[model samples]
Target: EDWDLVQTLGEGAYGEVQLAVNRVTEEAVAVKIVDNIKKEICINKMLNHENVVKFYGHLFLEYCSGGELFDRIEPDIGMPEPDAQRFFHQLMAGVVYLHGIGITHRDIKPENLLLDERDNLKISDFGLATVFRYNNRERLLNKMCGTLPYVAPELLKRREFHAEPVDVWSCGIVLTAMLAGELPWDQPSDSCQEYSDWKEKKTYLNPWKKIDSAPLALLHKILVENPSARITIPDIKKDRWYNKPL
Candidate 1:
C-alpha cells in the first residue's frame, strides 16, 4: 500500500520518525527514516513483539515505519489513571513476553514506551536488548547499561546480576512515574550519586497517599531497594490491587 507522510512525530540518534497514513488502508502509522542502513537492519532483526512495537515493513533509504512507544506520550499530554494503568499493564506484558523469549530489554524507561491511537502501550528501543541462551553461563550482566535513574542497584555497582529482575526494577520506576505524573528520581540533581542516594535512602515522596492500601503495599514490594528482594511478575500479578477492588 502507498503511504503518505503526514508530519514528523519524533527523531533520535537512530532515525527520524514521521506520522503517516497508509493510502490503501487509510490507517495511521509512524514512519522511521534511518540514516544508517546497517543500524536499521540490526534494530529490525532485534525487535519483534505485539506489546513491543511491531516492525510493519522496511525499505532502505525510503523509510521504515513502526515500533516506537515513547514518542506517543509527552509531558503536556500526561495519561490519566485508567489509561496509565492500561499502559503499565501493557508494559509488563511486553517485558514478560521478552523474558519468555530469553531476551531482556536493558532499558525500560518512559522514553522507550509508545502508544497508538487506541492507547495501546508498545515498548521500543531495543538497541541495548540482549538475547541469553539458557545454557550460556553468563546469565549475570554487568555492563552498566540504561539510564542511570532507571538502572538497578546491582547494575550501578557493576555487579553481575539477572537481567530480567533489573528490567523489572526499572519498570517499577516507570510505573511510579505514570501514577505520580512525574519521575521518582526527578530531584534537583541528575547525577548517579543523587539517584543512588534516593534509592538507598528510599527518599521517594509518596504522592499516592490516598491510594488504596493494597496497591500501595504492592508498589512498595515492587520498588524495594534491594534488587534481590524485589517482587517478581507472578507475585506482582497476584497482588490484591490487580485482582481486588484496590
Candidate 2:
C-alpha cells in the first residue's frame, strides 16, 4: 500500500517525519524520511518494539517533515494524574519490554515518546539506540547521549553504568515532570553543580509535598538518585497509586 503525504507534523536532527495516510486503508500513520539514506537504513533495520514507534514502511520522498512528541505536549500545560498515570504505565511497559529484549533506548525523554490520536505513548527515535546481550555484559555507556535534563548523572559524568538503570532514571524524571507540572531541574539560578547538589539534597525530601499520598511515594521511588535503588516496572505496578481510589 502507498502512503499519501498529508501536512507535516514536525522535523528533527536526522530528517523529517510527516503525517501520512495509507492509500489502501485510509489510516493515518507517521512517516519518517531520512536525509541520510545509509543512516536511516542502519537505524530502521536495528530498531523494533511495542513502545518504540514502528517503521510502518520507509520511502524515498521529497519535502518530508518530522514529527516530535515534545512539540505535541508543549501546547497542553500537562495531563491530569490519572491520564498521566496511564501514559506512564505504557511508557514503562515499553521500556521494560525493551530491556527484557536487550534493547537500550538511549533517548527516552518526553520528546522521543510519541502518542497517537488516542494518546498512547509510543517510543520513537532509535537513531541513538543500541542492542546488547546480557551474556556479553556491556558496561554502562560513557558516551553521552539524550537530552541533558533527563540524562542520568552517571551518563553525564561518563562513568560506567547499567543501561536499564540509566533509562529508569530518565523515566523517573519524566514521571516527576508529569506530576509536578515542572521540570525537576528548573530551580532558579542553579548551575549544573548546584542543581546536582540540590537533587541529592532533596532526594529525601518529598518534592510532591502538596500532591496526593500514593503518587508522591511513587514519584520518590522513581526519582531515587541511586539507580540500583530505583523502582522497577513490577514495583510501579505494585504501587498503591496504581490502585488509587477512583
Candidate 3:
C-alpha cells in the first residue's frame, strides 16, 4: 500500500486517523492508526454490509467527507424531517445488518454516524460494540458503558439486558434530536417530562418543527420504554416510513 499522508483526521488515546491517498490509484482514504484497535478487527472480519463503514484492511478505510451528523445538525432549527428520514433509514439498515451478524452496537448516536461525500451515512467507532449472541445462543449484555445522553433507561435499571434493544432506544433518541435539534431529556424514562408527554401525545410536543404523521408514528414505536414491546429491526423494515425510502 503506497500511500501519502495528506492531513490528520483525528487523534485520541487510542491513536490517530490520517487522510491519505494511494500513490498508485490516487484514491483518497482514511488511514486510522491505533494501538488498541481490536474491535475494528473483529467487526470488519465478518462484515460486508453497506451503511456500515467499510474497512479496507489493517488501518485503511473508506473516507467519510460529510463529517459528524451532530455537526451537520442545526442547534436552533435542527434538521428537516425529510433529511432526518433519510438518515434514520440508513441507520436502521446498518443496525439490521449488524444485528443479523450478532453484533450489538452498544453506542449509536449522531457523533458515530459518518457521512460520505454523497451524504451517505455509515456507522463508525466500535469501542463499545459487542457480540450479543455467540455460539448459536442468545445472551444478555451487562455493561454500563456508553455516552450517557443516549443510553437506554433499561440499561440503567437492570443488571443485564439485551444489548440490541438499547441500540433501538438510542436510534430513537438520535432521530428525535434530528427532528427537534435537541434531545427532550438527558435520560428518557417514566419520570422524564418528554418521555411522559410522548406516551399521551404520541410525539414530542415542541419539535424543532412539526413532524409529519408517518415519521411520528414510526418514532413512537422504536422509542417504546420496554425492550420487549419496542419495535425490532425487522419490524422497522415493515414500517410505512421505512418503506418510503430516501
Candidate 4:
C-alpha cells in the first residue's frame, strides 16, 4: 500500500477520518474516507488559509493532535481570558477568510474548531457549508441547519438569510462559550430565558453578567436579532476587544 491507515480519528455520516502514514516518507496525515457528500470534498479544496484545516488531495488533512477545541473548555468555569482571546482571534481570522472566499460555514461550534499540536486553531468540517456570494453578487439561503445552541435566531425563525451574518452569530456564541464555558441558551428563541432576557438588553444575567465589559459590548453587536444589523468582519477587525494587546 502507498500509505498505512493507522487509526480512526473521527466518524460520521460522511465517513471516518483516519490517521494515515505514507509508507515511503512516513509522513503523518489525517485521511478522510468519504463514502458520501462530494460537496464537502469540493469545499475542502478551495480552503487554504492558516486558520482553516490544511487539505491535501485524496482528502488528506494536516493532522491536528490537539483535537477539538471543545475539549479545552472547563465546564462553567471556562478557560482563562488570555487563552480564550487567542483562540477567538484565530477563529475570527478563519471566519474572515472563509467569508472573503464567499463561503459560509453554517456549523461553527467548538467541535468543528480543531487545534494542531502547536495549539493553532484550524476550522474543519465543511459538511454544512455553502457558498452565498460569487462574482461580487450575493444570494440568500433558507435552511434550518446547525446545532441549536450555537445557531442564530434567523435560522430558528425559518427565514431566508444572508450567509455571513449567521456565522457571526455563531462566533459570538463561541466566544461566550470559551469565556463562560456554557452556552447562553439552548436556542435563540422566545422560549429560551437567557435569550429572552438578552433580547431586552439584559447583560446583568449569569453568563453575560460574568463576561467582562469589553467582550460583552462586542457580543451585543454580534448577537443581534436582526442578521442584517449584525457586525461585519471588517467591523470586527477594528473592535477594541478583538484588537486588544495580548
Candidate 5:
C-alpha cells in the first residue's frame, strides 16, 4: 500500500480504522484494518452512492473529516432544525437506495452515519447488514442486532421479523436523536418509561414535545408498534417534514 497512516480514526470489534493519505495521489481515506474482511467488505463493495461512503480496495473508505454526526448535535438541545433536516434527508436517501437494492443496514445511528468536509452525511458501517429480500422474495431475520435505543420493538422482543421495518424504526430514532439530542428511551419496550408512555398515549411527551408537529406526525407513523404498519421509505420521501427546506 502506498498510503501513509495519518492517525487512528476509531476502534471497533474487528479492529481500528486508520486515517491515511495516499503518498503519491495525496488523497485521504479511512482504512478499516481487520483480521479479515467479512460481510462489511462485500456490502460496501456493492454500494456506490453519494450518501453512502465510497469504498476502495483493501477496506479503504472516503475520508470524512467532519467526524461522527452526533458530535455536532448539542446535548439536550440538538442540531438546529435546518441542519437536522439536511442530515436526515441525506440519511433517508442513503437508506432508500439500500432498501431498493434488497440491502438492509441493521445498524443506523449517529455513530454509523459519518460527515464529510462539506458536511454531507454518508451512511457507513455495514457490519450488521443483511439482504432480507432476494429476487423479490422476502426473508425473516432472527438476530437481535443494532444499538439498543435505535433497535425496533420487534427486534428487542427477539421476534423473527422482516429487516426493512427495523431499519425504518431506526431511522425514526436517528431523526429523533438529531432533533431532540437524546434518545426517546433506553430501548423501545414497556420496561422503558418513555416508550411505555407513548404506548398508552400514542404520543411523546417532554423531549419529543419540543419538536415541531410536522416531523412529529411522521414519527408517529414510523415508531408504530406493528412493524407492518411502519412507514416505508417511499412514504417518508413524500412527507412534508422530510421535504422541508434547509
Candidate 6:
C-alpha cells in the first residue's frame, strides 16, 4: 500500500518484474506482478538464507538488476576460469544450502541464475522448486521439466532419482555452460567422452578454442553422464578447482 510503480524491469516465465518505490522509506524494490501472486512468493518465503533471494509480502522480491548469468557469457571470450570458480562456488554454496533445508530447485540452468546489482549471483525461478527429505539418498523425485542440456540422464531415462543429486548434475551443467557456451551434447551420452573429444577436435566450436586449459578435468567429474556416479555438491565444494585461484 505504500509503494509507487516506477518502471518495468523485464519479463519471463514467472511474470513481469517492475521497479517500485516504497513511499514510506522512499526505497526501491522489484515487484513481480503476477496473477498467481503467491506461487513464487511462497517458495522464497520458505528460505531465509544469504544465498537465496529474499521475499516481500505475498508477491514482491529483492530487486536484482545485474541481469541474468545467461547474458554475461560469450563462448569465445568466456569468463576467466577463476571467475567461473568464484561463481560456481557461490552456486554450489546456495545449492547445498537450499538442499540442507529440504528445498530442491528442480531447474538449475544458467538462465535461472540471477545477479544482484552488486553482482552477487543467486539461484532464482522456484516454480519447479519442491521439498524433499534431505536425509534420504534413495528418495526419487517424480517430476521432470528442466532445460534439455542441463537435464540429468536419469530423468531422460525416466528412472527414479533424488532431487539433491539432480541439483548436483545441474550445477555441473551450469558450470560447463559458463565455460563452453554450449552443451557437449544435444542429449548426454553415457561416457559422452564428448567433452574430451570436443576439447581435442576444434571442428565443433570453430572460432573458439577447446575448453581445455583451465578446469576441464574437474568438469568431467561433475558432468558425469551417469548421474549416480556424478560428484556430490559437497564433494564439488572440495574440488581442487573450486578452491584454487584465478
Model 5 error, position 219 (Å): 0.9
For model 3 the local lDDT of residue 196 reads 73
Cα deviation in Å at residue 124, candidate 5? 0.5
Q: After superposition, which runs of candidate 1 have C-alpha atoms over 4 Å from their true positions?
A: 23-27, 36-48, 59-80, 134-138, 186-212
> Could you give candidate 2's per-residue lDDT for residues 12-119 as a string of tens digits?
676676778779887777666665355544555655665567664564222212333454443324447786688777888888877777778787877777776566
| Ten-residue stretch with the least lDDT total in model 5 | 198-207
How does candidate 5 fare on TM-score?
Answer: 0.95
Scored against the true structure, residue 204 in model 1 reaches a CA lDDT of 45
Q: How does candidate 1 score on lDDT?
A: 0.65
lDDT of each: 0.65, 0.65, 0.81, 0.89, 0.87, 0.72
RMSD score of candidate 1 (Å): 4.5
- Candidate 6 error regions (>4 Å): 36-39, 134-138, 189-209
Worst 10 residues of 6 by lDDT: 199-208
Clashing pairs in 6: none
* Cα lDDT, model 2, residue 245: 49
RMSD of each: 4.5, 4.5, 2.4, 1.5, 1.6, 3.4
Model 4 quality (TM-score): 0.95
Q: For each candidate, how many residue pairs have backbone atoms clashing (under 3 Å)? A: 3, 6, 0, 0, 0, 0
TM-scores of the candidates in the order shown = 0.76, 0.78, 0.88, 0.95, 0.95, 0.85
Q: Encode model 3's per-residue lDDT on 74-171: one tens digit a residue.
A: 98467877798899888988998898889987888898899999899989877678888878789898878777678887888899999888999899
Which parts of model 3 have CA positions greater than 4 angstroms off?
189-204, 244-246
RMSD of 5: 1.6
- For 1-246, candidate 4 gives per-residue lDDT tens digits of 488998999887656889999999898889888752677779989999999998887788888999999999998877888998999989988999999999998999999999998999999988889888989999899878899999999887866888888899999999998889888998999988888999998878778887999988899899999988899888988999988886
For candidate 5, lDDT tens digit of each residue in 127-175?
8888887889989999788888899999877658888889999989888
RMSD of 6: 3.4
Whole-model lDDT, model 2: 0.65
